[PDB]
Design an enzyme around this catalytic site. Sequence first.
Site, PDB file in Angstrom:
ATOM      1  N   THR A 161       0.679  -0.951   0.310  1.00  0.00           N
ATOM      2  CA  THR A 161       0.398   0.068  -0.227  1.00  0.00           C
ATOM      3  C   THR A 161       0.720   1.013   0.166  1.00  0.00           C
ATOM      4  OG1 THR A 161      -2.050  -0.875   0.971  1.00  0.00           O
ATOM      5  CG2 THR A 161      -1.837   1.443   1.252  1.00  0.00           C
ATOM      6  N   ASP A 310      -4.532   0.946  -5.526  1.00  0.00           N
ATOM      7  CA  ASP A 310      -2.899   0.797  -5.409  1.00  0.00           C
ATOM      8  C   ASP A 310      -2.341  -0.330  -5.910  1.00  0.00           C
ATOM      9  OD1 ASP A 310      -4.417  -0.394  -3.570  1.00  0.00           O
ATOM     10  OD2 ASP A 310      -3.635   0.692  -1.963  1.00  0.00           O
ATOM     11  N   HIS A 311      -2.712  -1.606  -5.908  1.00  0.00           N
ATOM     12  CA  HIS A 311      -2.335  -2.473  -5.772  1.00  0.00           C
ATOM     13  C   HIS A 311      -3.742  -3.394  -6.114  1.00  0.00           C
ATOM     14  CE1 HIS A 311      -2.720  -3.126  -1.545  1.00  0.00           C
ATOM     15  NE2 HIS A 311      -1.899  -2.703  -1.660  1.00  0.00           N
TER      16      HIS A 311
END
Length: 807
Positions: A161, A310-311
């Site tokens: 994150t 973010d991911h």
Amino acid sequence: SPWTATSGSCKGRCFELQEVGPPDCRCDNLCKSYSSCCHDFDELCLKTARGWECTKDRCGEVRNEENACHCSEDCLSRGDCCTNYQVVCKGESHWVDDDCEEIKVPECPAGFVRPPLIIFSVDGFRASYMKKGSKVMPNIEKLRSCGTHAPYMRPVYPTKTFPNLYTLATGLYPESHGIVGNSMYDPVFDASFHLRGREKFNHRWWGGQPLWITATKQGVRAGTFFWSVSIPHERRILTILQWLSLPDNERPSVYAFYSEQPDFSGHKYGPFGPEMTNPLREIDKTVGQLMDGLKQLRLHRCVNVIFVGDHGMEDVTCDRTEFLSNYLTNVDDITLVPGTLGRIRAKSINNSKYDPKTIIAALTCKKPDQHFKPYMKQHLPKRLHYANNRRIEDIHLLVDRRWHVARKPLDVYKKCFFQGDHGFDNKVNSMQTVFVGYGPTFKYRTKVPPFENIELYNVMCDLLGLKPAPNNGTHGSLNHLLRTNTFRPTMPDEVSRPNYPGIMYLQSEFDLGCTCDDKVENKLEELNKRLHTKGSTKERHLLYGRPAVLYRTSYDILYHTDFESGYSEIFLMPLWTSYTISKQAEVSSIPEHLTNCVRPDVRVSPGFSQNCLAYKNDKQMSYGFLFPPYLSSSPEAKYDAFLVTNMVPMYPAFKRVWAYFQRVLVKKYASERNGVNVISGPIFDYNYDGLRDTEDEIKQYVEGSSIPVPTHYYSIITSCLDFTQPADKCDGPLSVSSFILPHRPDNDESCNSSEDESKWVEELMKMHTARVRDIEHLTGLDFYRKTSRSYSEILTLKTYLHTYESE
Ligand SMILES: *[C@@H]1O[C@H](CO)[C@@H](O[C@@H]2O[C@H](CO)[C@@H](O[C@@H]3O[C@H](CO[C@H]4O[C@H](CO)[C@@H](O)[C@H](O[C@H]5O[C@H](CO)[C@@H](O)[C@H](O)[C@@H]5O[C@H]5O[C@H](CO)[C@@H](O)[C@H](O)[C@@H]5O)[C@@H]4O)[C@@H](O)[C@H](O[C@H]4O[C@H](CO)[C@@H](O)[C@H](O)[C@@H]4O[C@H]4O[C@H](CO)[C@@H](O)[C@H](O)[C@@H]4O)[C@@H]3O)[C@H](O)[C@H]2NC(C)=O)[C@H](O)[C@H]1NC(C)=O
Ligand SMILES: N#Cc1cc(Cl)cc2c1C[C@@H](Nc1ncc(C(=O)N3CCC34COC4)cn1)C2
Ligand SMILES: [Ca+2]
Ligand SMILES: [Ca+2]
Ligand SMILES: [K+]
Ligand code: NA
Ligand SMILES: [Zn+2]
């Protein structure tokens, strides 16, 4: 902690934009996280009464300042209506129920100097949620379909994150901005960064220049991007909408919203657990509140909105844990940063028995299905850009998707029930995340190819009229996302002009210790050889112009029938070698009589040449060739491939990889792609900074010589995107794949390397896939100088990464 005088008041200061320092109590969106809010912050700033929605009965109510949001007639002028006020009370439609209508120009209220930017950031939002969750996310699906979207956006490694959010903010790789993980030890500071606690709030962790500082320094006001976890999402949206109601001279132009979902639930339930539908619905409802609220303020055709993650999130369970205690004798003498990546260092700097080499060896190919691979950080794939920071431990474990690594079994159960995690290699499909841009400055109903999140800072700067701080994006590579505000760069200026040497040396001037069985004897073909050496075939082999050299050096252009090179007189080898292989090209052998052939180049002085004696004396180092003798156009042309100016130092172990690439794979790619153009060459990055080494940085030479040893070998393999056209007669856009192979003296990285090359070399090459831009940084060269394509299109091409994942 530091003392705060909480006895002050937030009256008139709720969600104040300017920070106030200890000991003064705070009223900003992060104050809760520092335990420093004034005593009346909850009462004044986090009102909850009557919830978040207007109802028929509240329409035209007498204002009650206690209410979380208002449905009184004065609420639009105060800027504090509930987001659904106009729908419930004034017969308006929800934004999501309105038809997509192109936003050709900003439609902004009087006093707006520029379209504001609102970044709607979502944690753990896996790319495939846009399709798989589409039936429960109508607001997000409308942004996606009507605006500009990519099928996915590639995060940075590690896919955690804080590294990714801070890369969004800065345009930098983690190794450069300094947030290299969610957990870190800085040996210079002697300080530890953790998700829990106060250390992470210290400014010395956070490098680069994030977007809110870039804005502020250039006269563009920013909302504060970080929200304390306990502030409900509804209140974060209302806060943004209230800030958008401030007077012109006080009102920010850039804002960020953040959601902890769907990451929070994804860890508990896995990426696709049935429990995940509700978090996606809730996020969509939040998006709808924002858009309704913008519509109320007459800003829904004025603001640019970015929806970005973010991911992603992978399935990971406690049972899929590798334990270092099953590999290491000495597990009590190491510190491991564990999980979806591993980082190892000595437990004690006073332990003179600690030895990284024995740790690496004990972790290398020890169990058949082993679910991690150890690396010294400099040996990690260069595409990860994960080495040049003192916070990154020398020993790294790349963990397979779906697995964890831990030090000992008790580490897993002295605290699991989790079913999801993230952090893996940023090429892994499950780690990909999302990008949508919607608004006047983005394109309408437009799909763009996947791109890397390091590119977004530049675009967000373009959206706000800011000059970006120096960063790792390639400014202009995302111009195709934008209707307006494109950045139109010029190609970098060539610094070093080539020499074009002719025949200037007799054979006997060379005393290189080389031999070649090439003593064989025509006026017709005499002229042909001379034409080839003056560049008569260069149009075939150099398809996109000479690479430009962007630093001061001395080099020669050398032409041949089958290949062209830029030969460094300083490094005694090519910087680049360019050749084209048609679909119809034939592969041939190195003839028996030529196996050990190396030939002086009569265009290049003995003093600026390699020598064979050094290779004979260096019992660890052999040599290979950049233009492959296997792909000579004729027996006579093959002699050119054995010139000393085409030779490069190669460890025997690496020659196995290189020879299979040259003899088998190049022709395979030409067959599949309808011809290929190949540019190959050395890279020197001994200090692992991702940038071309100067001579004085080189740590290894061929024994007894000034011949420097590359750390890596690259190739850039270009063809026509329309594969019905051959690479050498392409009228349109290009297709590229590239690699940066580590030049290692063993194949320990490849656990199946005892097998034939057909079973492992291509796998190694896929792991070490690269962007052209990565090679540019590492070589100081600029490619694709002379094409028919727009410069921004070429910048996009140079940022492309061939990932070799499925759909
Ligand atoms: C991705 O994009 C980024 C950004 O463009 C690229 O990074 C830049 O690359 C440059 C080269 O590596 C580097 O330039 C150096 O800057 C040195 C001073 O830097 C400070 O000031 C800047 C500007 O405000 C600031 O951004 C820096 O921030 C870094 O360090 C702080 C800690 O103080 C961190 O919080 C922050 O995260 C960041 O860390 C990162 O970079 C540093 C390097 O600076 C790394 O060590 C970290 O691991 C981390 O990656 C700094 O606060 C400057 O002093 C250098 O000048 C030397 O070089 C020339 C060469 O000829 C020489 O002539 C000079 O005399 C000088 O040498 C002398 O000092 C040497 C070093 O001690 C010594 O050995 C000699 O003997 C000499 O005495 C140099 O210009 C620039 O800082 C970074 N910027 C950032 C933000 O990282 C990056 O390359 C891109 N990546 C790729 C792959 O393309
Ligand atoms: N950098 C960056 C960045 C870049 C862009 Cl483009 C958008 C955003 C960001 C940041 C993000 N807001 C945001 N992120 C994390 C948190 C968070 O975790 N908090 C606050 C206290 C804790 C620490 O543990 C709990 C809160 N708020 C919105
Ligand atoms: Ca996250
Ligand atoms: Ca370097
Ligand atoms: K040798
Ligand atoms: Na091996
Ligand atoms: Zn997470």
